[PDB]
Symmetry: C3
């Protein structure tokens, strides 16, 4: 599970991307609930920040980043667009 | 149930604007909980996204839009400013 | 307690800044739950808007402001960056 950067520097990210790779790709300093083992995946993280099942169209925010749900894979996010804030 | 486009592209919308007219106005692909008979107006969609009673000053997000609650009629939203994020 | 403006015009705010100073500093029309006595500081306000204990990295929104949690002091927010959205 993957990360591709686009011709404006925004990221198209697979929802199943794991926390260590996600932090690397986005330069995150932390994730919410770190070390508590609540979720292990970008999709889970977004679900946690939303406090409910995400839907395509949903937007959340974390550190320097706007996270938009681009597509679902039933109970999980398939694809996310990550855009730098500013 | 009006909408009115300001000088800068942004939209002033009635909170009782129905979902059909809302998709058409803002070019929304979808709405949350579509076909689940959960809300029928922009006011109810904003309330769903916030997961609580809206207040004037509240900001929510969906697709390419920032939706700001500009005015209330007691419990229901009366005016909403929609702005397209980039 | 206090508020310092960066050269870019954004504000670093102490989490314990009280409602009157906050409104004056950011030119707020209101704050949520005004005169309900729910919270009395910026930290309490953001905790109210998130619906849970804030974490460093969280972002919330009110009126024309993006509110980023910069640092925590255990149960309370220590520092916030407020940036005018437009």
């Amino acid at each position: 599970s993957n990360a591709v950067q686009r011709e404006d520097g925004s990221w198209l990210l697979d929802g199943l991307i794991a926390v260590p790779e996600l932090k690397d790709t986005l330069g995150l300093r932390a994730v919410p609930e770190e070390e508590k083992g609540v979720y292990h995946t970008l999709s889970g993280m977004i679900m946690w920040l939303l406090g409910r099942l995400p839907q395509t169209g949903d937007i959340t925010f974390w550190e320097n980043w706007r996270l938009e749900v681009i597509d679902m894979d039933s109970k999980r996010i398939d694809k996310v667009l990550a855009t730098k804030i500013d």
